[model samples]
Target chain A: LADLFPGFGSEWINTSSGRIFARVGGDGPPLLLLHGFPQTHVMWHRVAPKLAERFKVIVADLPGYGWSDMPESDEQHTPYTKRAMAKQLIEAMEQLGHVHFALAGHDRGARVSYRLALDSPGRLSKLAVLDILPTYEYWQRMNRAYALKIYHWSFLAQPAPLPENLLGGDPDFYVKAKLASWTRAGDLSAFDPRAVEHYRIAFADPMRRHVMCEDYRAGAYADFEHDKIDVEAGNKIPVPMLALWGASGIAQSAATPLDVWRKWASDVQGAPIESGHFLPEEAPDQTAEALVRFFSA
Target chain B: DLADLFPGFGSEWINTSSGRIFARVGGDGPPLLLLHGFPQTHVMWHRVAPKLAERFKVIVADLPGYGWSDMPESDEQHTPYTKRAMAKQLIEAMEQLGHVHFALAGHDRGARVSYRLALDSPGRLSKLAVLDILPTYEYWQRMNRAYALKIYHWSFLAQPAPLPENLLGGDPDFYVKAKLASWTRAGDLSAFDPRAVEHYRIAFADPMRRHVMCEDYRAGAYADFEHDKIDVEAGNKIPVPMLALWGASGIAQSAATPLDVWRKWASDVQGAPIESGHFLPEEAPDQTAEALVRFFS
Candidate 1:
């Protein structure tokens, strides 16, 4: 994995919340890259190296995903909540001697970055989320088409052992299928074989699979409540925000992603990239370029 | 099973343009066609059909792609599982049974097919009763947190092909049992007769049967919504009198007002809430039977 980023250094940082696996490289302004669900920081392998050329890049696997420590869930699945995950990432950044940074995330990672921007507004200079809307807004606008495309949000969120037991039956098939389904290319061909292997190896563990379910369970239950509370409390992102979605993905089919984001952030701008939900891996050049432009600006 | 449940009723498999439909036929006076919903077959009518059979000739049958019926191949568009196809099959079965016109009533998936039958075969259906559902198009348009949480399976089952099938088939018993328990007012399987539960389990145990059920929902989310949208655009409404019955404690009540919503798609519509949950026939068989008899007569 380190070979993907020739000059990058790999380390496990223990935060107040939990330990996180990260790849740090490049130089200049600090920029943190967060990976999404069912995959790890390796998801940015296609884009991170390029972005590193212009900025200090730190790609970290969100806790409970990849090689990060999995914490036990509370009654509300709080440990896996975006708030908790974001706190861990924020702590990791502070530990790495960066008091403030520009942040970006894809999928579930984007969810964490969203919460991070709201909960730790002063710590982030800029925020960019790929292929997602604010979690609360997404829940608010769910329809049959949106629900059908993202059924796993509910399935994996079902209480406890149900989702874990179901996914444990064929984790490999489940991971591969999600990769193929979410891409505009309509297959795993868009994903590098090595990155896919990384996802598979990590998800193959039963505990990791359970933790993944908890992450989504938290999204549907706890995270959703937190987001709602934040919205009601008028807690909006203070930093400049960029929301990018896949032209061919379910998010675009539902609504204009930027319009939804604008409601949650004070200043937001976005457009669609010619790809699918796995924007970074499917359209790395566009993804990296978008991040560079947004962060650099 | 027929003798025990329906007294002197006779059962037969009538071949239709789509496939062979298994039905139980008996009673006298006006012909009343009954369609059972998902996770159950005509057996779902065991408690309600016989009572309705006294005044009306009740022909209760399983929808195509469910129960003892042959599973037809579904296209990418999921045409085979659309209510149009299911409705056409039921209409053909009624015609083959020598009833040119009939009073039709359906619950859940069956209600969807019944409504479709009313729209497409207007002259053939003298009256229509849709139990526990809003129009597919309305459902997609007005989805909210309550609806999404309560009817999450609508999305889960509609996901592309094997994803839902595999997860459901992994433990059909658990899935069926959970659904039955969750959607009922009783919140337990006790409300269902052990025999009925056994029948459901047996049918669900068949892996192909589980796949076909998912196809039914896939059709509901995709092709059925498209058909409804087209109908709405064409201003095509059911000409026959329509009755909408929903469980007071079920998704139908919480999601939307069934009567008000049904009025948009029907020329004449009236309904009241039954004292049960989603499985009206099983949970409130007396009320369901009485309602059907009064409306059909």
Candidate 2:
């Protein structure tokens, strides 16, 4: 994993919320990278290194995932809410001497980044959310196809012990299946062997499974409530935004990604990449290039 | 199992052009066809069917590719498993049973088949009762996180052949029990009689039946939805009096108002919420049976 980020150094930042594990390197304006579910910061290995050349790239694991500490959850699942995760990541960035940053995230990380942009306006110069619609919009426009494609959202969001027990039954199978299903051709060829191994190792832990469930439980309940509140209060991301989606993924098939994002942000631009849900890993070159152009602009 | 549950009921397999369908017929007076949903066999009606038998001649049949019914091979379009095809088989079976017209009721996947029967064979069904489901078209259109998460299997079971079939086959017993427990108000398998539970386990134990079940859902997502779309576009409504009963504590109640949704696709629609969960028949057999008896009469 270190070799994937030649110049970056690994570090654990203790935030008020929890301990965050991240890799930081690069020179110019700070850029924070977040990852999605069932995966760690390692998902950015393919794109983050290149982004590092033009910006200070910080790739961090979402709390309760990877090596980050799993905070115990309350009935509201506040511990793993995107708001909580975003606060922790922001604190990590602040400790690294950056008060503001260009932010990007794929999957779950994208969710946290979006929340950060909404909660702390002016903290991000620009934001890029990969392969996801706004959480509010997602829940609003769900149907059989969307539900079928993203079943894990509900399964993981089920009241704790249930999802954990089922997922723990065969963590490897579940992880691999998700990776395969979310990819372009429904196979593992798009993922690096090392990255895949990292995912399997991290997810194999029963505790990780529980924590991950809390993450979604928060998303389904508390996070959904927050998004609804934000939308109701006319909350919107103030920063320029880019919405990239997998051409072959649910984000493309379900709705117009750009059109959906336009409603949530004042300035948003994006198009489909020739990949699936894991756009960064599946089409790293295109993903990195898009981020460079969007952030640089 | 049949004799233990339905003392005087006679079990038979009626061969149709599509395949042989397993059914249990008992009671007297008017004909009332009963259909069962996924994971469980026709045995789901064990509690409800006997009580309804006093007023109506209950014809409880397993949908093709489920229970003891023969598994037909799937096509690219999953024609064999579509509700249209399933309804056709049931119609043929009823015709063979010396009833061309009768009242019908179904739960879950069975409800889907019953709806199709009402729509496609309007003259054959005197009345229709759909338990715990919205029309496929309405469901797809109004899907949200709550609905998607609650009914994730609509996608999981719809995934092409071997994927879901294989995953479910790994622990059929767990899958069946989990579904039964989760969808019930009590969140436990206690609502299901041990005999009926054993029947579901025995039926799901066969990998072929599991694959066929997946095909049923696959057809639902594809062919069935297309059919529904065409009907909705044409404004072709079910002319028969319709009763849509849902569990007050189930996905149907949380996701959509069953009565309101049914009215859009049917004429003379009336429904009420039974104080149970997804398994209305098993969870609130007396209430469910009484509802059917009142509606059918």
Candidate 3:
């Protein structure tokens, strides 16, 4: 999946939550791609096509991102929590005739992948997480220094109505601020305006906005609780894992050290890509090549 | 003695027609060598070195392409920024100053050379201290997304061709603002005065600044590792007792990995981190001076 568009093409379908679409292209074994928050399935457009040539690439927008439907309620029945959302995605994949697949995710999708591995261990052969750490590690280790670099965590996770109102008042403000400040200016030039516009549209919707904040807030609390339960129960991922990080993203001492990840998975090996925080967008070829090689091995 | 300013504090001289060297010599005991980092000069240690000189001699010099160091006569694709070359020049310069078996302490890029000094001439150093760096090779092995982001300059400066030169020379205030802004916390910027910042600004303003920075990072990737490996193969440890310190506010907490780094280079190593910024000498003079004195004693 190294090109912008995989030959498989897109087919819209209805899921339990809402109307969604899927694209199955390329030629090798099965691989599922999930995109992160404040982003659409388009984030994977650059890397997925290349992988599609060799692997049956399954790329989808999460329930609240991209063209997926936004839930109107916070009910536990809704596919909003990463665990519920992962279950829904897997069910959708199974309905499309793929039983087991290798899974890789970026940002929020990474979180969903982690939960998928924990809840349905046998469904994924190999798992990869791009540019993220388990929720537990974040809350335990983060301090003012970290808060300074990643201001969003503190801003979004703050006592809510305030965060909701503030972010809602000027949605593009946060998105633009992050885009301008988080990545290097040179690397920032690497991102196409189309991709930038996609993110802007995603963040502009109010329900999508609430989902985004809720995802982070859930991660700040409930997700950690889930992770803790899974850990204590010894329900670790048995799949071979590859954790790729953006060299300019957050992943170091407290984040996913391959050795540290090895604690929860049978095998984990990967390094950071010398690109921007947006790994695939900034260094598509390198990232795609790494994924193909890693999954094939 | 602490109040007595050295005549050579800001003295400038040309070295080998291209590299300009700045020297600051004052106080007296056993002659001690001081090496500076990029975008900075001898002035970084002004606050602490004088206190150090109260009980031990201090000899501070700016590396080529920094501070008062002159640029190369003609621009070339690559000038010798290899660790061995830098170590040799530093030693030869010190030898010219009648230094033999002197104690040495270096900060940041200077510390990389300190590692080279211990590796290249184990007998000439009575004691060595390297602040805020691991053996460059060891560091490279652990590089991840977080590290690459936090220290983007390592990659930015290491790139070959026009990338570095283009970026550094793009804006007049780029080097100074980037250095001061990224190097320390907002609260700690005032620790070092405008005089000290001016020295850094001038050192970084040189047209050849990018070349020098690229070379320094290159040492980590190329020369430093090879030298470290050779030393390890020969079972050669630093002949002198070593004192390594880092800023508690920075990454030098890797001192906890003493068994891997310190014992690999020195049979006897005493290292710790002090509460300060990257420029710990200026940020925490008394504490740093105390650490050096205790280690040397």
Candidate 4:
């Protein structure tokens, strides 16, 4: 409800899943900023304002996130799949007078960014993924260590109302704790109240909570399958990729982030920024500076 | 509260390091101890315990953090909920009840605790029976699409406190009922006593109970796995005779050979599938009790 992206233009971009919410601002080489789990486009508030000063910034909530429409998800969660999400975003960009754009995505959005790169081929001029591994890598590395780090991968992916019903108790507590715990400091110290407010409100809604679970259900089902097919087919991101993870975050829990990304993309480069999972918010200056260096190059 | 599903059984709250463990004692013979699984309490043994009592002094106790038991504090390591921790307290409780060495039969989560106790205190059990579970180590190694679909609660409940507690507390009855119905061979609640199911729901409806329940899973995800792995690597087999039973359509069925998996860690082992699901004690009480009577005797 509050305006974190002051002076930015807001629009609802229609896609196959439903209407996606977007905040567009600045004017330079276009870059689409996608947010990850339990977060909205507002996660980019700290970095977006800075990134917008240099590059044209379009920050959009993934389908079923923030103010986006909640579409009916199927048994396979096809509508919420990263491939479907990527396709929808590409179309959204195309409709916004851009044929190709640079994409820096964090969390689930990073999943969509890499997915978009793998599926759409030449649509992204460059890709920056924040704090995550490819879906296949995650499933492949399902050991006690990584499983504890990202239990939500299995929890939210649980069938329908089980998760939705369970999460219905206190959305604000659930989302806030998630945002805080994933930070390097293990608290909300790094987060802006405005952005946290946005996530807290959206996750509080039952339908959005269901939508979030559907998104994870896609990860557990279709999104995971898409990545597996790509891996088996020897497919890699055609675009140059930049991978930035939080120092004490989810991605760092795996093998070296850069090393893993190299296996998925030929021309990948990046490093661990000092923060937790929400890089753009926890360390926005370094995240923005890193993106500017990667995309502006 | 629901009526005493276990008619004429003696109830006592025995003080153990884990807390006051609520145990139901009935019948008379060589002491036989039974443990219940998730979403249900010791009441899960109601249908089977009366019959098993004919051959053995049947003692059924709720696992710590389950039905009628004292709910402990949630921890990062899930300390109190660990099978090892639960086993220690359970043994103490049993000893206080004048059964230093007894035949142990555990279903689901209780089964994990039973095995952990057998491994940790080999001399304490005259016989061991595990209903519908593989060793925690084996289960971790076999993590896949199939297991995630069926045993997601292994990870979901293991998630850090509040997330699972919040969700489960939202609609505890729905969760308890759905879990009972889904995992049955009959694919409905026909296998469960509505009274028994009501007890399970009422316990889970409390935020305190749900929090401790979540801790139990957290222990499953970490401490239990670590304890199991140490023995598994050392090839520490169960010192006593062991009986393993799985549900015909239970999540344990996802494993091609549950007995074979159990045999890896037990010297003397034998088992087959019951015409039931995960809640074997409730779904196939006669068959389950018959097998237990034969094994324990």
Candidate 5:
């Protein structure tokens, strides 16, 4: 995994919520990249180094993901909420002397990214979300197509150990099948074996596995309510926003990503990458090109 | 194999256009079909079927993918697994047995198929009784916090292909026992016959059977929900008289009022909660059978 991100330095930044594991490289304007579920910051191994050429890239795992601590579980799922994660991420960035930075996230991280933009205005210079819509949009539009495409949102959000108990037996198989199915090719060929190995290792621990469930629990309740209350009270992101989705990802099957993003932000632009849900891992060159173009401007 | 449990009942396999349906037939009066739900076969009615045989012709049959019945391969539309498709096939099975018209009673997944049959061919069911379930459409609509927790399998099993199947297979026995124990009023498998449990264990072991079952719920969220909505919009409610038998502490009660939900889709609906949980036949077979006899007569 270290070999994948050459010349990058790794560190664990302490925060009140938990310690965040990060990989930093290059030296321009600060740019933070957050990874998705069942994966770590290693998801950006392909694209981060390339971006580091122009901008200092801070690739970090969301709390409870790869290399990060699984925060204490709670009735309200407070620790895993996008708001909580976003605030902690800000604190992590502050610790690294990044008062302001550009941010991008995929899947779970993307949810956190947008929440960061909404909750902490002016904290980001630009924002980009990969392969996801807002949590509110997803819960409201859970019809036949949406529910089938992203069944895990509901499945993982199940009360507790039901999902944890069921998924605990074979974490490797779960991770492998999950990554493969969301891809355009419907296999693991797109992923780096080393990165996937990292994911398998993280998920193999039952405590770490339970954290993913907590993430979804927040998505359904805390995150859903946050988005709902904000939307009802007329809150929108002030920074420039970019929306990217896979050609065959769940977003493609739902409402148009760009059209939906427009309602939530002032300056929004994106397109479907010729890849699957894991954009950076699946199509690194295209993903980085889009990022450089969006953030550099 | 269920010969001991279903005494004096004739085991018959009726061929349909696409597959064969295994049923146990016995009794002399007008026909009554008893269909079982998930994780169990028609053998779920082992305690009820013999009693129903005394007053009316009792034919308890397995829905597709359960017991000795056919496990037809699924299609992209899940056409073979939808309640509408299974309903039509069951009609063919009934007609083949020279019972063109009959009283129908179904629990869980079977209730879904039975209600679909009643709506699809109003004349085919002389009287309709749904045990321990709201309509599939109603269930999807009420998938909020508590209902989602109570009936999570609807989402988990419906997830795309091998994820749920592989996870379920990892500890098939525990999964089966967990579902049974949790859904029963006694909070254990005390009410279930050991032989009947073996039937479910064998069924759960078959990978194809597990897949078909997922297809069953996939159809539930998609085609089934769509069909129900269409009928609602078209005002094509159930024409025949209906008896809605919900378990006292069943997932149906997770809804506001079971009969009120039923009122939306049926005209002449009457019912009460049996002193049991989701498994009415097994948990309170005497009360379940008496209700059927009273309603059907």
Candidate 6:
């Protein structure tokens, strides 16, 4: 079944609730790689071999996305929130005998990685939250400028029969439109076609549609609530951190975008990659190298 | 007589053992009290306060621990090092200067008094800001292995007997070098003016410097805790807007919950991370001043 997708031959295992999959090749303590929206585990294929030499790499399709199962009961699981998804991944990790690990996530995956760091600091030796601010900071600071650029976050998370109805006819419209719109100057060529197809499969399914909306809905409500608690408790992850963002991306303010991340992590070092927003895909070598250096150190 | 050298400044006295107290600074708008930390005088605000004075009647004082103020002769003088005593002295000093209600902000030792000012004189402060601290009680109680390891100075000072004094005084340059080194990241030492360094030297050179410092830390465990308890029992709420800033790279305390902790002590609390170390006013003066102006206004 896994061989049906090109360059994605990793075995798929059934968890109690959903399916979990990973590429088997690698060497050191497992490095868990999570893919963001509009992509899947296949997004890491090009960079995986390079990282595999130094660390065992585990890349996955989050629940309700990619090869993972759609919701068993729509009412019980309409939204696939990062917090809920993080828990499933954590349980899968425990099932795989990975009680501890290093974490790196790009785009939506980075958001989940943040939830992981906040929820279970004891399990993470090092954390790298890529290309996004804390959800609370993002919502609080979203102004005219940000709303114009990232309209989808506000648009898609809305009561979703509208979003699904608008984009459903093509089903693959989100993948094609996002890829075409998000980058410039041949950057889309960097992403694998198979990964886009995986995203299409998830968005095409009506059941999984709720999962996607729930992810964003939770950001507005649950995630922000969690951040507020963290804010009040002074919860800081005492692990070393590496934060990476593309220089040409939205947070170009010279005020140091990483300051907020530094607030939650004890030690941090990073610089923006002088490229586009699809950082790991557009500049895989730099992204992979940063992970290697950060994890090894 | 003092007009030429101390333009826009005035002096008054608190009738303590020192006979009269003195504070200086000037301008118009709401009254703003500026507190200085240890090993320095009101001069700590020389760069930052002038900017604030444009819209505030700024008052900078050499608290009893340093400057022209007399160091008390008796060992019993240790109790005055407590923030309550220090705060009363500040209130009397302010009253004598003919000021009534005001906004307050402090750094280091001055920050401790500002906390007390919030507790004891809640109605007097329109707003309060503390730079780089949690209440002493919260800090000591929650400290763990990671904390003690990071903040070696806390243990060194909290140790009983003459260990703290003996070792700290082992080299006359010890305190100065320690303060200069830890107050900022490398390349920031240049911001410490020669006169500023001289002020620190004179303050630490006082015979009871160790006693003063020990009493300050001890108050966190004993006196300050009692004060906080009483305030809580009386249903005291620091009903002032608060803005807390801590250095991202320099402060040894956990900043994860600074905003949260401040909320417990203060009603309207907000916190931010300053990229530089502890001497943010000296090192990242522009950023520091901007945050202060934005928050206080």
The fraction of reference interface contacts (C-alpha pairs within 8 A across chains A and B) present in each candidate is 0.58, 0.51, 0.00, 0.58, 0.40, 0.00
Q: How accurate is candidate 4 locally (lDDT)?
A: 0.86
- Listed in order, the DockQ scores are 0.50, 0.43, 0.02, 0.61, 0.43, 0.01
RMSD after Cα superposition, model 1: 2.8
lDDT of 1 by residue, A1-297 (tens): 435666799879889767998899999999999988789999999889988888899999888888888887788888789999988888899898887998998888999999999999898999999998877877877776577767777778777677777677778888898889889988899988988999998889988988888888888988999899988998889889999899986577668887778778999999799999999999999988888889889
Find the candidate with the highest DockQ and give its number. 4
Q: What Cα-based lDDT does every candidate model obtain?
A: 0.86, 0.86, 0.68, 0.86, 0.87, 0.67
lDDT of 6 at A244: 86
Writing each residue's lDDT as its tens digit, candidate 3 over B1-297 gives 123234434343525433546677776789787887766777788877777777777888777555665544323423356666667777776776677678889888788788788878877798898877677655545454334334545554554444445545644355554565455644335877677776677656665665566666655555566777687779877767888788766554532363356767778887887787677777777888888878775
Weakest ten-residue segment in model 4 chain B by summed lDDT: B143-152
**Per-model TM-score on C-alpha atoms:** 0.91, 0.90, 0.56, 0.94, 0.88, 0.47
In model 4, the runs with Cα more than 4 Å from the true position are B13-19, B70-80, B144-146
* Cα lDDT tens digits for candidate 6, A1-297: 123223434757566668777665676887888877666666676677777888777888777667777544333232366667777788777877777988887777877888788888777778876677777666655443343345455545544344444445454545556664555343357555665566676667765666666666666567777776886788876767788877765444322567877777668887787655667777789888888888888
What residue runs in model 2 are displaced by over 4 Å at the alpha carbon? A1-3, A267-272, A293-297, B1-3, B28-30, B169-171, B268-270
Runs of candidate 5 with Cα error greater than 4 angstroms are: B1-20, B24-28, B70-80, B88-98, B137-152, B181-199, B221-237, B248-264, B273-276, B284-287
Top-down DockQ ranking: 4, 1, 5, 2, 3, 6
**Candidate 6, what DockQ?**
0.01
Across B1-297, the per-residue lDDT of candidate 1 in tens digits comes to: 322466688887988888888888889889998898888888889999889888989888878988788778878877778999888878888889898899999988998998888888889888999889888888877776656766778888888778888777666788888888888999889889888888888889899888889888888888898999999999999999989999998667786788888888998999999999999999999998898889888
RMSD to the true structure for each prediction, in A, is 2.8, 2.9, 10.7, 2.2, 3.3, 21.6
Query: How high a TM-score does candidate 1 get?
Result: 0.91
Which regions of candidate 6 fall more than 4 Å away from where they truly are?
A: A1-9, A72-79, A184-187, A250-255, B1-297
What tier of docking accuracy does candidate 5 attain?
Answer: acceptable
What is the number of backbone collisions in each predicted candidate, taken in the order shown?
Answer: 0, 3, 13, 3, 0, 5
lDDT score at residue B112, model 2, on the 0-100 scale: 93
